[PDB]
Amino acid sequence: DEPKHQIPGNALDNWAFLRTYAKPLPDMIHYYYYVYLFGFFFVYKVADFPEYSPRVLVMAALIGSLFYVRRDWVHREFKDSP
Amino acid sequence: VNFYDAPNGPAVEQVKIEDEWYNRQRTEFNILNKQPSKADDVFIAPNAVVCGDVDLYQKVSIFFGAVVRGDLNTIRIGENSTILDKAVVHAASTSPTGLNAATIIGSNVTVEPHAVLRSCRIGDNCIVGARSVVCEGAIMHPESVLAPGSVLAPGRQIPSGELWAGSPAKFVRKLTYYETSNVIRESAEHYYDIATGFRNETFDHGSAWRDAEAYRQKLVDYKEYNWVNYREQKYVMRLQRDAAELEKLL
Amino acid sequence: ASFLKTIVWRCGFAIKETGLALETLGCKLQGNYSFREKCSRHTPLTQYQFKAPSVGESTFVAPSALVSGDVIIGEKSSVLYNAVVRGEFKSVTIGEGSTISDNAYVGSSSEFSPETVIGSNVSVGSGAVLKGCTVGNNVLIGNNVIISEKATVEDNTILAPGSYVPEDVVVKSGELWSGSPAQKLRNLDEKELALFNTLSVGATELAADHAVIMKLLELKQKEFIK
Amino acid sequence: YYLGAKGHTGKASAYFTSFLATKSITLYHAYNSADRLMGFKENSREVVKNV
Amino acid sequence: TFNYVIPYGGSSSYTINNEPVKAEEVTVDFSKEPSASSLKLADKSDWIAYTFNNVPLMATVGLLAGAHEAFLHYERTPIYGKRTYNIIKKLAPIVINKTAYATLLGAIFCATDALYENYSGKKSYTSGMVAGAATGAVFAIGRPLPQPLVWPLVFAAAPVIADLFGEVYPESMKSARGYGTPYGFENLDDAVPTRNPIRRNPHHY
Amino acid sequence: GWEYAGTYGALCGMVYAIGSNVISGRAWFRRPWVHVTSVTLSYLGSKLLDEVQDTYYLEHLKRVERKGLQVTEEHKKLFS
Amino acid sequence: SLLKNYPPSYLYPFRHPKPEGVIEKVLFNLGSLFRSAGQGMDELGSLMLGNGGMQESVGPNLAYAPVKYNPAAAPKAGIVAPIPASAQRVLGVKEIVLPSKAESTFIAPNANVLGDVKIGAKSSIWYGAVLRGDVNSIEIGDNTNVQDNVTIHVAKHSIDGKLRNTVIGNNVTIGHCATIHACTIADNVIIGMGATVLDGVKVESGSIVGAGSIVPPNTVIPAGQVWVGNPAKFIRNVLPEENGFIASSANNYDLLGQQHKFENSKVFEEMLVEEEIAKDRELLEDKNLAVHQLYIFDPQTQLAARPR
Ligand SMILES: CCCCCCCCCCCCCCCCCC(=O)OC[C@H](COP(=O)([O-])OCC(O)COP(=O)([O-])OC[C@@H](COC(=O)CCCCCCCCCCCCCCCCC)OC(=O)CCCCCCCCCCCCCCCCC)OC(=O)CCCCCCCCCCCCCCCCC
Ligand SMILES: CCCCCCCCCCCCCCCCCC(=O)OC[C@H](COP(=O)([O-])OCC(O)COP(=O)([O-])OC[C@@H](COC(=O)CCCCCCCCCCCCCCCCC)OC(=O)CCCCCCCCCCCCCCCCC)OC(=O)CCCCCCCCCCCCCCCCC
Ligand SMILES: CCCCCCCCCCCCCCCCCC(=O)OC[C@H](COP(=O)([O-])OCC(O)COP(=O)([O-])OC[C@@H](COC(=O)CCCCCCCCCCCCCCCCC)OC(=O)CCCCCCCCCCCCCCCCC)OC(=O)CCCCCCCCCCCCCCCCC
Ligand SMILES: CCCCCCCCCCCCCCCCCC(=O)O[C@@H](COC(=O)CCCCCCCCCCCCCCC)COP(=O)(O)OCC[N+](C)(C)C
Ligand SMILES: CCCCCCCCCCCCCCCCCCCC(=O)O[C@H](COC(=O)CCCCCCCCCCCCCC)COP(=O)(O)OCCN
């Protein structure tokens, strides 16, 4: 026997939390199609954007990073409900 | 006699042992659908015989006189495991215990000369002594040693970190930390060095084929040598066998 | 020195390897593929680098036997069929009149093995495993006896079949030993004491007959080759 | 020949490869000579040889 | 120096100065000067005008983030099953709230920056740090204990990075050329150019 | 250019032969013919790479002189 | 087969037919020069290599090997055969005893069977087994399996008249690495792996001798008993199902011997052809190859069987 890390939580509760990731998985082409199209149009529009201060650009990048939701997070938490 | 459903086909010409004028034994050869697999650094002695579904991992050494027959079931020899002289490793079709009957040998396992292993699980860093018999379904757990002249009866177990001896093998002493950590691995490394040496002075096609080539050339010069399309003959023999099997009434 | 001998061996081996490769290339150009033959490449007297088995004139070494490394075999000794005598790592010495029987292993190939010494009129049984041990004159070893490293067998002794000799265990003269832990059973009676030389000479006679037959086999092979 | 013998067709591969490479290099040389005649490339030997 | 007796490096006389000498005889520039739109947006005189000019960036970023999340939800909803609830009623709050909160954070940042620069009267690191600190404080109003500290620090650190590598870095290394003679060392005998290298034209995309 | 290119190439041919033997599980001395071939081809290749580098160095010097870089005779000596 | 235009090198990989084109003839002569130069370089290298020169030769076939015939002691199990006349004027032996085996018997090329050995049909002598009948006869019955590295030995009867021949009955299994000296084994007996059976031992039918057990000399193991130990002692009686195991082991090793005999008995040219069969089987595993669109290949021999 060896000293081991204590695992917080009950075994069955943690397994139940992990089982909430087993949901119908959409194929990634649907996201990719829209991202490609809107990205092409976006790159066309960017050349017309006004020149922004570097400070504002960095703050916008920080806000976007904070606001970005990982695709797995929506996967676990999605409910087909109002 | 002739296996007509053999993977490479039936044998067009079969020669009797009386008619052989030289030893034609192959150190690695295929028994029907079962093919032995070997790594680049695996040493098989010229005397040694390896047949059947035997998988040889990297740094496996098969020394002189050892027979590893993988005809009934699968044999796996782990990394840096050495089968020493005249030691037989064989596999049973079924095991008495009811578990898998394959002969699985772990890493850094030294099987000392004339030791017989049949359908046993040998754990990593184990030593089987000289003239030690491990029977079907017997499992040696890792870091265990069987003393020379000892028998593990079918379905028996040797626990880890223990030295076992006797014809009804019994516990003798607990192996020390230094032993299990170093010496068992070191023996396999030493025999790997010996086998590496033997490999380094081995030619790819040693000059023993010249003697048979002399006879073949003499036959060619005297016009008795015959050119046989074995592929076509195999095809024709299989066709004839199928036609006859259709014709038969009983 | 040893380094000079190693360099000489490497140079000669490179030359021989290149010569064999060129011969194989010539065979490939001619369309002959006999070099691909997987036949028994076993040699009864193999050498490891410059260490080669020294062998006597009256000795019989079986074709299936393997005498490997620097093994000195004295006159009127016999290594019988499928017997493995390994002396690469440490040398092995066999005395006059000594017999190594079928399927017997005598070697000094473990890392810490002492040099194996076998005395005169010593018969090793069929199946016995001898590793790094000293055996004295006129000793009868059983069929399946295991003798471990550094163990010593004194003169005029018989080891019963199946006995295992632990290391640093001295088997004393005029005695009979047996058991997985070898222990003295009885003192040898006079008849067994006299029997040793008769056994050795009978083995020598049998070896001479086998040598005649082996020569017959070699002539039959010569007829095919030439 | 060396590559085709690995596929048991040495002679045909040898002739095909010879014809192929010879045709390509001959066209390269002819293009260079035509450029020399057109005056694009150096032509002192050409003008001397054929006035 | 490479010795243990006298100090390493060297010193330059402050009294002695070296006359500037041109890196090349004729200077051709492929770097375009700032546009009037860039100077307009950078102008922080009127804090309301500065805020309203620079918020469209923040609103855009919030709209992309909300669109990403809303599409992740939409992709999951089943077309084959008819749904009792209205999908856009579910999805519109996502995008609208993300965009609004992003715009609010960017507005606090820009307004505090302009107000501090006007009150201080100087362009400094401190304006960006204070605007970021306020924005990160607004980010962590009701959040658990580490976050009241970490978000003001991160949001303040971001303008420091922007100032350090967007303004100080370019201005520190304007003189260094890479061709001809080293900027400090013109006495050394290196090949002197008639014209500077033009590795690319002024861009127009 | 480099004055030690050929020696380097021969040593690197040795590197090829020995490494190829070691990767395949063979000892360094195995397949002796590969050693000679590797050494000779690697030496020739290292030389050829050096002349190629020198030639394009000189082409760049000609181009920059045409463009207006006032290279001196000593600077012209730097490019062989 | 479907096609008859296959290249001759493809049809005869072991030895290409005589060169017919000029280029082929030149290649043949160049190969001859290369062969001679390579042999010369081989000998020069062998000089440096020292005593032995790492020379290699073909080994004799000892699976069917003779022993000197004794006019006093006539052969009992094996047959006696004359030897070639030239060997007669060299060696001087008139006749030599040869082993006697049935056609169904499988003897491994590694195994050494010598002299007075009679082996029955469907019996198998496996790899490394040494069967010496130089002094006295050895008899092995039908469906009897002498496994790997087994040594069977005999001695002379001597003044007492004690029978020192080795008689092994039918359906007998001798385990790997077992040593059997001049003993008698009855039918349907399993000898364990590593077991030593000494002189005078009679093992009755239906018995099992345990692995690594030395049965003492002149000991009778009675029928239907299991004996194990260094001084082999009785432990239990054979269970009724264990008898069916004894028979099943004998039959399974008969099938095993048939397979191994089939593999070993192929000639070289057939073995090399089969190696090429395996190789182009591996190359033809890709089913998107152009040739697969052309033809369907026979599975056992990858020859074009029918067009696709
Ligand atoms: C209707 C269609 C739906 C889409 C709508 C939009 C359609 C597109 C329109 C136009 C698209 C072009 C512009 C969009 C952005 C370009 C990205 C893209 O297209 O790639 C294809 C991408 C899919 O590609 P993929 O290969 O399948 O996914 C790879 C991932 O592994 C995906 O797997 P994952 O999601 O499971 O894993 C995500 C992972 C992936 O990693 C990333 O996201 C990398 C993003 C890093 C920044 C990207 C470079 C930023 C430079 C911006 C340049 C402009 C400003 C210039 C100056 C800025 C200086 C930095 O990141 C994370 O783990 C989560 C954190 C996210 C940011 C991580 C950085 C955190 C820093 C904050 C520190 C604070 C913490 C302190 C406390 C910590 C305590 C210890 O599609 C999109 O994601 C587009 C979604 C649009 C939402 C973006 C929202 C803001 C956009 C602008 C802000 C820029 C910041 C970027 C945020 C994250 C963007 C991914
Ligand atoms: C560094 C900075 C970086 C900057 C840029 C770097 C540059 C980048 C590029 C550089 C790339 C370098 C790295 C790649 C290296 C290339 C790879 C490589 O090493 O070879 C791979 C390749 C791999 O061979 P492998 O591993 O066995 O696999 C092929 C299989 O066999 C497959 O079997 P196969 O069916 O395909 O068989 C075809 C082939 C493959 O077959 C073989 O390879 C089997 C072996 C060939 C026969 C043995 C060669 C006999 C001469 C070898 C000398 C070794 C000396 C050592 C022992 C000393 C003995 C006294 O057969 C051939 O050898 C074709 C060549 C024909 C020549 C055959 C020999 C002619 C007779 C000798 C001519 C002259 C004799 C004078 C003196 C002779 C005694 C010293 O090696 C060869 O194919 C060898 C071809 C040449 C044989 C050596 C001939 C040398 C001439 C004798 C030495 C005289 C002095 C040399 C100067 C004067 C020249 C005349
Ligand atoms: C002309 C007359 C002749 C005179 C002689 C003059 C000839 C000149 C030199 C020729 C000598 C032959 C060169 C050796 C060839 C084979 C070397 C080798 O296989 O390595 C291990 C090999 C022994 O390994 P092994 O037990 O036989 O088993 C290897 C198995 O294949 C795989 O075993 P494993 O699967 O268990 O892998 C376990 C692995 C654990 O896994 C790892 O750690 C992998 C890590 C990735 C690589 C390591 C990254 C760091 C390496 C730093 C370089 C070391 C030098 C540091 C000096 C700073 C240089 C800037 O541990 C190791 O393998 C050993 C760890 C330390 C060795 C790492 C150094 C190897 C660098 C690359 C080797 C060259 C391969 C060329 C390929 C040729 C065509 C195939 O050699 C050694 O005994 C020690 C390495 C000797 C290093 C010399 C190689 C030169 C590299 C320096 C770069 C400088 C540029 C090259 C210029 C060279 C002079 C012109
Ligand atoms: C030394 C100069 C003269 C060399 C003589 C050759 C000149 C003949 C004209 C050129 C023909 C091709 C040259 C041979 C190169 C490779 C040929 C080849 O692959 O060799 C063998 C097999 O491949 C090999 O063995 C590898 C050999 C590699 C090269 C080794 C020879 C090196 C010298 C030859 C080339 C030197 C230059 C040729 C003239 C410029 C071919 O097998 P097969 O197709 O079955 O033909 C043999 C005919 N038959 C079996 C029926 C007898
Ligand atoms: C990679 C650098 C990122 C900084 C990491 C610091 C630790 C992160 C913690 C987050 C805290 C927010 C960031 C604050 C760092 C700035 C240092 C404060 C010093 C300070 O207040 O002076 C200002 C100038 O320093 C400045 O603002 C410019 C100094 C540049 C920061 C230090 C650069 C080296 C630090 C690297 C440490 C190791 C790297 C590992 C992160 C004012 O100046 P003023 O002009 O406004 O005068 C005032 C007239 N009103």
Q: How far apart are the first and last CA of chain D?
A: 44
* Cβ–Cβ under 8 Å, residues G131 and G125: yes
The ranges assigned to domains in chain C are 2-225
Position in ligand 4 atom list of the atom nearest CA D8: 44
Rounded (5°) CA angle E86-E91-E93: 115
Distance CA E95, CA A82 (A): 16
| 3-state DSSP assignment of residue D36 | helix
Q: Do C19 and G19 make contact, defined as CB atoms within 8 angstroms?
A: no
What is the distance between the alpha carbons of residues G130 and G121, in angstroms, rounded to a whole number?
19
CA distance C12 to B136: 49
Cβ–Cβ < 8 Å for B130, C146: yes
Task: Say how far apart CA C119 and CA C138 lie, in whole Å.
Answer: 7
Going through B30-169 in order, the beta strands assigned E by DSSP cover 37-38, 43-44, 49-56, 61-62, 67-77, 82-83, 88-90, 103-105, 110-111, 116-118, 121-122, 127-128, 133-134, 139-140, 145-146, 151-152, 157-158, 162-165
What distance in angstroms lies between residue G140's CA and the mean position of ligand 4's atoms? 56
Q: Chain A closest CA to E19's CA: distance in Å?
A: 35
CB F13 within 8 A of CB F43: yes
| Residues of B at the F interface, defined by Cβ within 8 angstroms | 39-41, 196, 199-200
Query: Looking at this protein, which amino acid is placed at residue C150?
Result: K
Contact of C55 with C74, CB cutoff 8 Å: no
Gap from CA of E160 to ligand 5 centroid (Å): 6
CB of B69 within 8 Å of a chain G CB? The answer is yes
Interface test with F, best of E188, E194, E196 (most F CBs within 10 A): E194
d(CA G228, CA B114) in angstroms, rounded, equals 19
CA distance G217 to C178: 14
**Helix runs in E24-86, H state only:** 36-42, 47-76
**Residue type present at position A14:** N
Beta-carbon separation of A81 and E161 below 8 A: no
Packing angle between helix E87-120 and helix A54-67, nearest 10 degrees? 150
- In angstroms, the separation between the Cα of residue A76 and the nearest Cα of chain E is 11
* CB-CB contact of G133 with G153 (8 Å): no
- How would you write C120-167 as a 3-class SS string? CCCEECCCCEEECCEECCCEEECCCCEECCCCEECCCEEECCCCEECC
Q: Residue G220 pairs with which residues in a beta bridge?
A: G202
> Which of C17, C38, C79 best probes binding to B when mutated, by most B CB atoms within 10 angstroms?
C38
C-alpha pair distances (Å), E129 with each of E108, E117, E142, E159:
13, 12, 22, 6
Q: Are B104 and B132 in contact (CB under 8 A)?
A: no
Dist CA G301 CA B6 (whole Å)? 10
Instruction: Mark whether F and B touch (3+ CB pairs within 8 Å).
Output: yes
3 state DSSP class of B104: strand
Looking at the complex, does the CB of residue E195 fall below 8 Å from at least one CB of chain F? yes
The residues facing B81 across adjacent strands are none
What element of type H or E holds C13? helix C2-30
Quote the CA–CA distance of E193 and G121 in Å, as a whole number: 101
Q: Would you give the DSSP letter of residue E178?
A: S
Q: Determine which residue's CA is closest to atom 88 belonging to ligand 2.
A: F33
Q: Are C107 and G176 in contact (CB under 8 A)?
A: no
CB-ligand 1 contact for A39 (6 Å cutoff): yes
Q: Is the CB of E65 under 6 A from ligand 1?
A: yes
Residue closest by Cα to atom 12 of ligand 3: F15
Residue B180, token pair as written in the block: 């299990």
Residue with tokens 């081991």: A4
Nearest CA in chain F to B41: F25
Helix (H) or strand (E) holding C186: strand C183-187
Residues of C in contact with F33 (CB under 8 A): 18, 21
Distance CA C79, CA C71 (A): 11
Ligand 5 centroid to residue E65 C-alpha, Å: 30
b/e code G47-58 from CB counts within 10 Å (16+ = b): ebbbeebbebbb
Hey, of C15, C79, C224, which one would you mutate to test binding to chain B, going by the most B CBs within 10 A of its CB?
Answer: C224
Q: Give dist(CA F42, CA C23) in Å, integer.
A: 27
Dihedral sign (CA G35, G39, G41, G42):
positive
- The first and second tokens of residue B136, run together, are 């079907």
Domain span holding position G104: 64-262
Here the tokens at position E75 are 């992709």
Could you tell me which residues come within 8 angstroms of residue G117 by beta carbon, excluding any fewer than 6 positions away?
Answer: G77, G78, G99, G100, G101, G131, G133, G137, G138, G140
Which class for G289: exposed (0-12), middle (13-18), buried (19 or more C-beta within 10 A)?
A: exposed
For residue E26, the cross-strand partners are E195
- Of the candidates B46, G173, B30, B127, the one whose C-alpha atom is nearest the C-alpha of residue C64 is B46
| Mutation test residue for ligand 1: of E68, E72, E95, E103, the one with most atoms within 8 Å of CB | E68
Half-sphere exposure of D14 (CA within 13 A, CB side): 10
d(CA F51, CA D49): 34
State the Cα–Cα distance between residues C122 and C127, nearest whole angstrom: 15
Q: E50 alpha carbon to ligand 1 midpoint, in Å?
A: 27
How close G293 gets to chain C, by Cα (Å)?
Answer: 31
CB pairs C-G closer than 8 Å: 212
Q: At what angle do helices E146-163 and E125-139 cross, to 10 degrees?
A: 150
Q: Which helix (H) or strand (E) holds C24?
A: helix C2-30
Q: Which residues pair with B151 in a beta bridge?
A: B133
User: What HEC string does chain G produce?
Assistant: CCCCCCCHHHHCCCECCCCCCHHHHHHHHHHHHHHHHHHHHHHHHHHHHCCCCCCCCCCCCCCCECEECCCCCCCCCCEEEECCHHHHHHHCCCEEEECEECCCCEECCCCEEEEEEEECCCCEECCCCEEEEEEEEEEECCCCEECCCCEECCCCCCCCCCCCCEEECCCCEECCCCEECCCEECCCCEECCCCEECCCCEECCCCEECCCCEECCCCEECCCEEEECCCCEEEEECCHHHHHHHHHHHHHHHHHHHHHHHHHCECHHHHHHHHHHHHHHHHCCCCCCHHHHHEEECCCCCCEEEEC
Q: Which of C65, C61, C99 is nearest to C82 (CA)?
A: C65
Ligand 2 near C18 CB (within 6 A): yes
> Residue E195 and residue F71: Cβ atoms within 8 Å?
no
- C215 strand-pairing partners: none
- Show the CA angle centred on residue G123, arms to residues G118 and G125, nearest 5°: 80
Nearest residue to C43 (alpha-carbon basis) of C22, C74, C67: C67
Tokens of C224: 């095919």
Angle at B79 between CA B73 and CA B85, to 5 degrees: 70
**Is-contact C154 C173, C-beta < 8 A?**
yes
CB C219 less than 6 A from any atom of ligand 4:
no
F42 ligand 2 Cβ < 6 A: yes
Q: How far is G256 from chain D (nearest CA, A)?
A: 38
**Whole-angstrom distance, CA of residue G69 vs CA of residue G81:** 9
3-class state of residue F15 by DSSP: helix
In angstroms, how far is the first alpha carbon of chain B from the final one? 20
Task: Please classify residue B200 by burial: count the beta carbons closer than 10 Å to its beta carbon, then call 0-12 exposed, 13-18 middle and 19+ buried.
Answer: middle
CATH-assigned architecture of domain C2-225: 3 Solenoid (2.160)
The answer to whether the beta carbons of residues G253 and G145 sit under 8 Å apart is yes
Shortest Cα distance from F44 to chain B (angstroms)? 30
**What backbone phi and psi angles, to 5 degrees, belong to C151?**
-80, 145
| Structure-block tokens of residue B175 | 């192996």
**Contact: B41, F27; criterion CB under 8 Å:** no
Nearest CA in chain E to F71: E191
d(CA B37, CA B29): 10
Which one of the ligands is nearest to A56 CA? Answer: 1
Query: At CA E133, angle to CA E130 and CA E137, rounded to 5?
Result: 140
- Which of C34, C127, C164 is facing B209, going by the closest CB pair? C34
SS3 content of chain F, % helix, strand, coil (to 5): 75, 0, 20
Cβ <8 Å between F70 and E192: yes
Dihedral over alpha carbons C203, C206, C208, C214 (to 10 degrees): -130
Nearest CA distance, E38 vs chain A (angstrom): 5
Relative orientation angle of helices E146-163 and A54-67, to the nearest 10 degrees:
150
> Which chain G residue's Cα is nearest to D2?
G27
- The alpha carbon dihedral of G258, G264, G267, G270 has a sign of positive
**CATH code: domain of residue G125:** 2.160.10.10
CA atoms of G140 and G138, how far apart (whole Å): 7
SS3 at position C106:
strand
**Tokens at residue C70, please?**
């620097």
| Cβ of residue F77 closer than 8 Å to a chain E Cβ | no
Q: What is the resolution of this structure in A?
A: 3.1
Chain B partners within 8 Å of G64 (Cβ):
17-18, 20
Task: Please state, in angstroms and rounded to a whole number, the distance separating the CA atoms of residues F21 and B41.
Answer: 12
Q: How large is the angle between the packed helices E125-139 and E87-120, nearest 10 degrees?
A: 150
Pocket probe for ligand 3: among F8, F21, F22, F41, the residue whose CB has the most ligand atoms within 8 Å is F22
Of all ligands present, the nearest one to the C-alpha of C29 is 4
- Report how far apart, in Å, the C-alpha atoms of G232 and of each of B128, B152, B167, G189, G205 are: 22, 16, 10, 16, 17
Whether residue E69 and residue A80 make contact (CB cut-off 8 A), yes or no, is no
Q: CA distances (Å), G235 to each of G136, G173, G184, G213, G226, in order?
A: 34, 20, 22, 12, 6
